[PDB]
Design an enzyme around this catalytic site. Structure first.
Site, PDB file in Angstrom:
ATOM      1  CG  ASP A 154      28.446   3.844   4.046  1.00 40.23           C
ATOM      2  OD1 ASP A 154      28.435   3.267   5.557  1.00 40.23           O
ATOM      3  OD2 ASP A 154      28.334   2.968   3.315  1.00 40.23           O
TER       4      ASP A 154
ATOM      5  CG  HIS B 101      26.746  -0.657   8.488  1.00 37.35           C
ATOM      6  ND1 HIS B 101      28.121  -0.069   8.798  1.00 37.35           N
ATOM      7  CD2 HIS B 101      26.389  -0.312   7.121  1.00 37.35           C
ATOM      8  CE1 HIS B 101      28.357   0.740   7.732  1.00 37.35           C
ATOM      9  NE2 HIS B 101      27.343   0.575   6.740  1.00 37.35           N
ATOM     10  CD  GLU B 102      25.338  -2.424   4.357  1.00 37.60           C
ATOM     11  OE1 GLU B 102      24.588  -1.837   3.519  1.00 37.60           O
ATOM     12  OE2 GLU B 102      26.481  -2.464   4.342  1.00 37.60           O
TER      13      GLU B 102
ATOM     14  CG  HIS C  82      23.251   2.200   4.686  1.00 42.47           C
ATOM     15  ND1 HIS C  82      23.971   3.330   4.856  1.00 42.47           N
ATOM     16  CD2 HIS C  82      24.572   1.510   4.536  1.00 42.47           C
ATOM     17  CE1 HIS C  82      25.296   3.366   4.838  1.00 42.47           C
ATOM     18  NE2 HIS C  82      25.705   2.064   4.883  1.00 42.47           N
TER      19      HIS C  82
ATOM     20  CE1 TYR D 158      26.896 -12.211   6.530  1.00 41.23           C
ATOM     21  CE2 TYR D 158      26.906 -10.046   6.610  1.00 41.23           C
ATOM     22  CZ  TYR D 158      26.306 -11.177   7.058  1.00 41.23           C
ATOM     23  OH  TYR D 158      25.245 -11.442   7.841  1.00 41.23           O
TER      24      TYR D 158
END
Ligand SMILES: [Zn+2]
Length: 177
Positions: free
Chosen positions: A143, A128-129, A132, A106
């Site tokens: 995903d 994005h994370e 989740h 990252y």
């Protein structure tokens, strides 16, 4: 989020990414609520209002979660404390725990903010994370398609439930692309 397990300037990379993710997520939520239908459809494969509402709600929740560093419903490790990172993985989420961690790449392989359409960056990987994490908004996303072609070739219901679709939409809104 509760930021933990941080060292060095990487901590600032993460806090910058959180603040940018909050702004990008709020801006993308506004687009889902009231913006261009065709652009929404490019990513979510429908123009229907209920889908727009769900996308916007999820994005607004992500923005709130990204806007704190000792709070919210999630924990965000600057570095993977467990060894769950696999090759080429930028970050991961443990949905049952509402725990997120960045992998070392990252920090080495992503810019803070991508200038090119659809390109990956720290802010949108963080965004994005958060999708989740079911504690942010249920259900947590899966995903199902990574990157523009795989994500945008999903069906509507898979896109709605695909983390990278949110990152891609947020990037497209910001870059006007
Ligand atoms: Zn993911």
């Amino acid at each position: 989020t509760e930021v933990t397990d941080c060292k060095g300037d990487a901590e600032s990379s993460l806090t910058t990414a959180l603040s940018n993710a909050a702004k990008l997520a709020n801006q993308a939520a506004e687009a889902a609520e009231s913006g261009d239908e065709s652009k929404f459809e490019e990513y979510f494969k429908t123009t229907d209002q209920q889908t727009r509402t769900t996308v916007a709600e999820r994005l607004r929740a992500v923005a709130k979660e990204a806007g704190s560093t000792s709070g919210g419903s999630t924990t965000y490790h600057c570095n993977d404390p467990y060894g769950y990172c696999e090759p080429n993985v930028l970050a991961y989420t443990l949905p049952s725990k509402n725990e997120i961690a960045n992998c070392d790449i990252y920090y080495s392989e992503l810019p803070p903010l991508a200038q090119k359409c659809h390109a990956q960056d720290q802010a949108t990987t963080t965004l994005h994370e958060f999708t989740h994490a079911p504690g942010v908004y249920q259900p947590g996303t899966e995903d199902l398609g990574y990157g523009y072609d795989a994500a945008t070739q999903l069906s509507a219901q898979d896109a709605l439930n695909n983390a990278d679709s949110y990152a891609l939409y947020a990037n497209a809104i910001e870059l006007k692309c």
